[PDB]
């Protein structure tokens, strides 16, 4: 996260850190708890992942340094990538992780609701991007989970900033005109979380952008509301 600030414990309890363990253990991507056995993340995260065997899902984590050899984690039973996914910039950047067991929800590990049926025309004005990613394009995975408040941009404006790409209704963009706050390397797969009527909804999945926090180059997110039917079909 560029231009963000440190979170505190329990602040974003649906945020998980997905680790790979091949050839070494490291944070790979963010993700969001959406059910007791289900993480929603980005399909692009699994480029070069040979199988679910090497993945570990950690929940209730504030600092990456909390993770040691005896830290509990969830195994991944299945990676479900959208059947139309080819590359992040062309959309369908969405994946479900089915965990090997059920999360028991606690103050530190909580689900986030999907965008609600009937809220199709809600204007979200309180949206936050979170993660352990870089604070600038040439950096390092951060220890403490970072947060940044970022305004949604219309798809029309977003297309004007990305005239080499097809910005579709299945994407949502977010960013300041002058830049300064954005996701960056290591944040993808995590949530764009928006609060409406004091309830958090998973509005976006952090996906891609041209650089990090550049002026007139918003971050691009998978528009979760357009995949609710797909999510429900897979989780049922």
* Consecutive H or E run containing 229: helix 228-235
Give me the residue whose beta carbon is nearest to ligand OT7: 209
Beta bridge partner(s), residue 172 = 221
* CB nearer ligand OT7, residue 59 or residue 206: 206
Active site residue 83: no
Rounded Cα distance, 180 and 188, in Å: 18
* Strands of the 15-20 sheet, one edge to the other: 55-59, 15-20, 26-35, 38-41, 95-99, 76-81
Of 69-77, 148-156, 163-171, 180-188: span binding ligand OT7 (CB under 6 A)? 180-188
> With contact defined as beta carbons under 8 Å apart, do 169 and 227 qualify?
no
* CB nearer ligand OT7, residue 221 or residue 227: 221
> How long, in residues, is the chain?
236
Active site residue 93: yes
Rule CB under 6 A: choose which of 4, 31, 186, 191 binds ligand OT7: 186
Catalytically annotated residue among 82, 93, 187, 201: 93
Rule CB under 6 A: choose which of 187, 191, 225, 227 binds ligand OT7: 187
- Using CB under 6 A as the binding rule, whether residue 220 contacts ligand OT7 is answered as yes
Which residues in the 40-59 window bind ligand OT7 by CB under 6 A? 44-45, 47
163 annotated ligand-binding residue: yes
Active site residue 65: no
DSSP codes, 148-188: EE--EE-HHHHHHH-TTS---TTEEEE--TT---B--TT-T
CA angle 39, 107, 184 (to 5 degrees): 50
Q: Which residues bind ligand OT7 (CB under 6 A)?
A: 28-29, 44-45, 47, 133, 141, 182-188, 206-209, 211-212, 219-221
Residues carrying an active site annotation: 44, 93, 188
């Amino acid at each position: 996260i560029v231009g963000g600030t440190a979170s505190v414990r329990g602040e974003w309890p649906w945020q998980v850190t997905l680790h790979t363990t091949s050839p070494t253990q490291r944070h790979l991507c963010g993700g969001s708890i959406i059910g007791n056995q289900w993480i929603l993340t980005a399909a692009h995260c699994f480029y070069g992942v040979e199988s679910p065997k090497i993945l570990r899902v950690y929940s209730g984590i504030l600092n990456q340094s909390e993770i040691k050899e005896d830290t509990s984690f969830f195994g991944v039973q299945e990676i479900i990538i959208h059947d139309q996914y080819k590359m992040a910039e062309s959309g369908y950047d969405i994946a479900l992780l089915k965990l090997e067991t059920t999360v028991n929800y606690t103050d530190s590990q909580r689900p986030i609701s999907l965008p609600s049926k009937g809220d199709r025309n809600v204007i979200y004005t309180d949206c936050w991007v979170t993660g352990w990613g870089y604070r600038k394009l040439r950096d390092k995975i951060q220890n403490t989970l970072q947060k940044a408040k970022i305004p949604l941009v219309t798809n029309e404006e977003c297309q004007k900033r990305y005239r080499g790409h097809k910005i579709t209704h299945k994407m949502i963009c977010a960013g300041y005109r002058e830049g300064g706050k954005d996701a960056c390397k290591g944040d993808s797969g995590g949530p764009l979380s928006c609060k409406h009527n004091e309830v958090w909804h998973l509005v976006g999945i952090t996906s891609w952008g041209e650089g990090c926090a550049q002026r007139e180059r918003p971050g691009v997110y998978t528009n979760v509301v357009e995949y609710v039917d797909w999510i429900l079909e897979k989780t049922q």
